[PDB]
Amino acid sequence: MMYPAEPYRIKSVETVSMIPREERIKRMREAGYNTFLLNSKDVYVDLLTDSGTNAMSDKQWAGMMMGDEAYAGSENFFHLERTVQELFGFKHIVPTHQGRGAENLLSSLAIKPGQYVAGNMYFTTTRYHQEKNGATFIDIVRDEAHDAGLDVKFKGNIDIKKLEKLIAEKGAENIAYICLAVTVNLAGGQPVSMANMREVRQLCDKHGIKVFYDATRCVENAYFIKEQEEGFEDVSIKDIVHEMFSYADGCTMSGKKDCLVNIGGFLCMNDDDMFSAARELVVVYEGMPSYGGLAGRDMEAMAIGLREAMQFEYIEHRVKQVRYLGEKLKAAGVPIVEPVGGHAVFLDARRFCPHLTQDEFPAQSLAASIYMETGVRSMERGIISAGRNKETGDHHRPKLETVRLTIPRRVYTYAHMDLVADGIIKLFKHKEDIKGLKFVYEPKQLRFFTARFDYVHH
Amino acid sequence: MMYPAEPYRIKSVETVSMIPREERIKRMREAGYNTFLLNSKDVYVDLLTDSGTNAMSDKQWAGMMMGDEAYAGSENFFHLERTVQELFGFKHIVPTHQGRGAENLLSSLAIKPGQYVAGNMYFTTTRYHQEKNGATFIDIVRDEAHDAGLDVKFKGNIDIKKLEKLIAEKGAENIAYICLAVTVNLAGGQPVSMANMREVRQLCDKHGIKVFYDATRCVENAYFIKEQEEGFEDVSIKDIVHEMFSYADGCTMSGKKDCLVNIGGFLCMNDDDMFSAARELVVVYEGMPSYGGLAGRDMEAMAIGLREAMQFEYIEHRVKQVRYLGEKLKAAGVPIVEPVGGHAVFLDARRFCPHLTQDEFPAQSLAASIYMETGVRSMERGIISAGRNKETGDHHRPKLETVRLTIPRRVYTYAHMDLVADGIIKLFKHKEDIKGLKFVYEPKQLRFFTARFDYVH
Numbered sequence: 001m002m003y004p005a006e007p008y009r010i011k012s013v014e015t016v017s018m019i020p021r022e023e024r025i026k027r028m029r030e031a032g033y034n035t036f037l038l039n040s041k042d043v044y045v046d047l048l049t050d051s052g053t054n055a056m057s058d059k060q061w062a063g064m065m066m067g068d069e070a071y072a073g074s075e076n077f078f079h080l081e082r083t084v085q086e087l088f089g090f091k092h093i094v095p096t097h098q099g100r101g102a103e104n105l106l107s108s109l110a111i112k113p114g115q116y117v118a119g120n121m122y123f124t125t126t127r128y129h130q131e132k133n134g135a136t137f138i139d140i141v142r143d144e145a146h147d148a149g150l151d152v153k154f155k156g157n158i159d160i161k162k163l164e165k166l167i168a169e170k171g172a173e174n175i176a177y178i179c180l181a182v183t184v185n186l187a188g189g190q191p192v193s194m195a196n197m198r199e200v201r202q203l204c205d206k207h208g209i210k211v212f213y214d215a216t217r218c219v220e221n222a223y224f225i226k227e228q229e230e231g232f233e234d235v236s237i238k239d240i241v242h243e244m245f246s247y248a249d250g251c252t253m254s255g256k257k258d259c260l261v262n263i264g265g266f267l268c269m270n271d272d273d274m275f276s277a278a279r280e281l282v283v284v285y286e287g288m289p290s291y292g293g294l295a296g297r298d299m300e301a302m303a304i305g306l307r308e309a310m311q312f313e314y315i316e317h318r319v320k321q322v323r324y325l326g327e328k329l330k331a332a333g334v335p336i337v338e339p340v341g342g343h344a345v346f347l348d349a350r351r352f353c354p355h356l357t358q359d360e361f362p363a364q365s366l367a368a369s370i371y372m373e374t375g376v377r378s379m380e381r382g383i384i385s386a387g388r389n390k391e392t393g394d395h396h397r398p399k400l401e402t403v404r405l406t407i408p409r410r411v412y413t414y415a416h417m418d419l420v421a422d423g424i425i426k427l428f429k430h431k432e433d434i435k436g437l438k439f440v441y442e443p444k445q446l447r448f449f450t451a452r453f454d455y456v457h458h
Numbered sequence: 459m460m461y462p463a464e465p466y467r468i469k470s471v472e473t474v475s476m477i478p479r480e481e482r483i484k485r486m487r488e489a490g491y492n493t494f495l496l497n498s499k500d501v502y503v504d505l506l507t508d509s510g511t512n513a514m515s516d517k518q519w520a521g522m523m524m525g526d527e528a529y530a531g532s533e534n535f536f537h538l539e540r541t542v543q544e545l546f547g548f549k550h551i552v553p554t555h556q557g558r559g560a561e562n563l564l565s566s567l568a569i570k571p572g573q574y575v576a577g578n579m580y581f582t583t584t585r586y587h588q589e590k591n592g593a594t595f596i597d598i599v600r601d602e603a604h605d606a607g608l609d610v611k612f613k614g615n616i617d618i619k620k621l622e623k624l625i626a627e628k629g630a631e632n633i634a635y636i637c638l639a640v641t642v643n644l645a646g647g648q649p650v651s652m653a654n655m656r657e658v659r660q661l662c663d664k665h666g667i668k669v670f671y672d673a674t675r676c677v678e679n680a681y682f683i684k685e686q687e688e689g690f691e692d693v694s695i696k697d698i699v700h701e702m703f704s705y706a707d708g709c710t711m712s713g714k715k716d717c718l719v720n721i722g723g724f725l726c727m728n729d730d731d732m733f734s735a736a737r738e739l740v741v742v743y744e745g746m747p748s749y750g751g752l753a754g755r756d757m758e759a760m761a762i763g764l765r766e767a768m769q770f771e772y773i774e775h776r777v778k779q780v781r782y783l784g785e786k787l788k789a790a791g792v793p794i795v796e797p798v799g800g801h802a803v804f805l806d807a808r809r810f811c812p813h814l815t816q817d818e819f820p821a822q823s824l825a826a827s828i829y830m831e832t833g834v835r836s837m838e839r840g841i842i843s844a845g846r847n848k849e850t851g852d853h854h855r856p857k858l859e860t861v862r863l864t865i866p867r868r869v870y871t872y873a874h875m876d877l878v879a880d881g882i883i884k885l886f887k888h889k890e891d892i893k894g895l896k897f898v899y900e901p902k903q904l905r906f907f908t909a910r911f912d913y914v915h
């Protein structure tokens with residue numbers, strides 16, 4: 001099926017207030033037309049992010065009642081450890097409170113100053129920790145990834161030629177590690193093929209270079225492999241996931257993404273010595289290696305969730321729900337990043353509002369309009385989030401001016417997707433009526449978080 | 459009352475396996491006679507730590523069903539924010555996944571390399587982050603705090619003269635901040651008086667020096683003030699807590715201690731510019747400032763728990779339950795660190811086992827024997843935990859060779875305390891039979907965590 005029904009029932013609901021348009025407009029204005037300043041209680045469908053917003057199962061909530069909150073030797077730790085060892089195949093695991101905790105550990109252990117880290121694009125926290133520990137980041141993603149309109153498979157693949165060029169120019173000993181992300185966020189949630197992981201592994205093995213996965217949406221990635229990589233159609237998600245990680249030396253994981261939980265993460269590695277070093281380092285940043293900044297009950301929920309994520313029908317429905325939204329928008333001519341990724345649809349607000357300039361903040365304004373029209377919250381990922389240039393004092397002006405419709409796992413229905421799509425399509429049909437915004441309050445940093453705007457009038 | 463009844467009922471119970479002695483001995487040996495290696499399922503009464511092991515209330519669990527897991531604007535965040543603003547009085551709050559997360563932020567923001575941080579003793583993670591950011595730690599606790607046998611009030615107090623001396627010798631500009639801990643862990647959980655907090659504030663204000671509290675057991679501290687500081691007998695715990703923090707510029711808090719939760723912490727501060735800088739920095743270590751590495755449900759549970767902790771009868775019982783254990787041991791002649799602190803009783807293993815040299819690891823062996831006798835787990839806090847001297851390859855030899863009996867909040871009863879005490883007392887009457895330990899496996903780091911031993915013969 002192009003669009004299968006939910007492979008589960010609703011056990012419990014989260015009630016919402018269902019406020020009318022006049023009230024939404026009032027709340028949007030109070031939030032300075034910045035969706036980051038909206039109160040959760042005033043949002044009907046919250047597509048700000050797929051991180052930590054997932055609906056857990058009855059089995060996970062049963063696990064939540066069996067939290068073994070002991071500082072050492074918790075049953076929940078042992079369940080998590082054996083689950084990750086079984087499903088990912090790594091020798092050692094260190095729990096962390098979420099993904100960027102594991103990144104702090106990995107980069108603190110695996111990077112000497114002056115070295116390079118190469119990856120298929122980047123994520124903000126991941127890159128921060130790499131650079132904080134002395135590394136220069138090199139993008140080695142394939143060129144197609146930077147063409148937002150280009151519909152091609154496995155857009156997230158590393159260009160092996162760029163990797164070969166790097167090794168020759170910089171020398172293997174100067175490369176801390178390859179950071180292979182699955183899926184690739186900055187490209188719109190694009191997958192990486194098994195063939196690509198193999199080729200990166202083979203080349204790195206030649207030169208003694210380590211590969212560490214940024215694995216936050218690895219199950220979504222496994223689904224794309226199963227659906228689209230020749231030869232994998234009859235291989236289980238579980239076997240695809242296990243094979244994927246067989247080509248890595250370790251990984252950083254955010255449970256908040258594909259482990260179907262609201263908090264949690266971990267660091268995996270095969271190397272005994274690195275594991276020992278990670279154990280003493282985790283103590284001062286996260287907590288003892290036996291809980292790593294997580295309650296027992298959350299290690300349990302993450303262990304259960306990761307195993308739940310392996311179910312074909314679940315991840316098929318997850319990805320096809322996102323696809324449904326994207327295809328409905330595409331059918332109406334709405335400009336989106338293509339192909340649709342695993343976890344989100346990205347609107348190109350620049351092309352949605354051709355009558356505006358980027359300096360009138362079309363992404364920020366389109367996000368405001370979407371909320372006022374529907375009660376749906378989306379995230380500005382454009383000029384506002386990019387922040388100001390510290391030297392010039394002018395805006396950074398990023399090439400991507402987008403509104404991100406980010407889909408939590410197992411929270412919404414196709415009817416919610418229809419509500420979102422219908423509102424956006426209505427706005428698109430009258431796009432010329434979307435007004436530009438200007439600052440009325442700008443913080444000196446993290447401006448996307450608390451900035452306030454009002455409309456430009458002529 | 460000397461020992462009041464629990465000011466609550468049991469809502470739900472946690473299953474334990476009631477395994478016999480022969481089986482406990484088997485499990486202890488499988489754990490290499492290291493209690494840190496015992497599985498939780500094999501422990502009856504787990505006194506390894508009071509951190510994150512607390513029992514929550516029905517109200518907190520109701521809150522756990524109302525987790526608003528939004529990335530921004532969570533109802534749970536706003537609840538936590540106004541609760542901490544109301545009860546602690548600080549202008550700004552940044553959630554963190556627990557205490558050491560807040561410490562990372564504070565030390566990253568408030569320390570220039572080459573500066574000093576002075577405090578009343580220290581805790582490992584707190585000091586690490588201070589030194590990592592280029593500070594030199596200076597102990598300015600009163601001398602009495604280092605006399606483990608001396609029974610005096612407010613042993614945790616800062617010695618104002620030591621602080622005056624530090625300011626004169628180093629200069630105010632070279633002191634990043636004063637780190638005032640409540641209670642003081644290394645002295646056995648000893649409180650700080652309101653009078654002391656005032657004097658420190660007064661002196662620091664004269665020189666423009668910032669004071670940040672390490673406030674993980676601030677409610678236990680407030681109880682000691684109410685109970686023992688002249689003039690506070692009829693002041694509420696809530697009002698004592700609020701006044702305590704009125705003498706601080708901010709704090710690092712572990713909810714896992716006195717906020718009655720299993721995970722959670724936060725950073726507070728009054729300064730706008732520091733807050734703005736903190737909001738930027740928390741994003742890459744913990745998470746967005748609107749959740750700070752916590753699920754919404756945990757921000758909610760911590761908000762509720764902190765308010766519950768203000769109930770006089772609750773914190774009175776908490777502290778008096780620990781005291782009950784300590785006094786029962788004292789009444790049988792068992793040697794402990796004195797006076798008894800708010801959250802734990804420390805056995806003096808050196809005097810418990812005078813027939814053993816420190817090289818035979820008496821604290822480690824005593825902890826093993828306690829488990830085998832009762833099913834009670836305690837923590838070695840002695841030569842093993844001290845680690846091996848890197849330079850000379852010999853043990854670090856700490857003056858304190860102790861076994862820590864750390865009491866989680868609202869988890870155990872007086873009957874459990876009796877079981878603990880009765881077992882230790884029986885061991886004490888036959889102490890000569892406690893055998894020394896030796897390594898069979900020693901890690902090169904964190905040796906207390908995974909080391910394995912067997913008996914000398």
Ligand SMILES: O=C(O)c1cc(O)cc(O)c1
Binds near residue numbers: 125741745746
């Ligand atoms: O795009 C996001 O959802 C996002 C979320 C964060 O907590 C930090 C960041 O740099 C980006």
Ligand SMILES: O=C(O)c1cc(O)cc(O)c1
Binds near residue numbers: 287288507583
């Ligand atoms: O004494 C403790 O319980 C303790 C706990 C920790 O997570 C670190 C540490 O250095 C000490």
Ligand SMILES: [K+]
Binds near residue numbers: 752
């Ligand atoms: K969450």
Ligand SMILES: [K+]
Binds near residue numbers: 070295510721
């Ligand atoms: K815990």
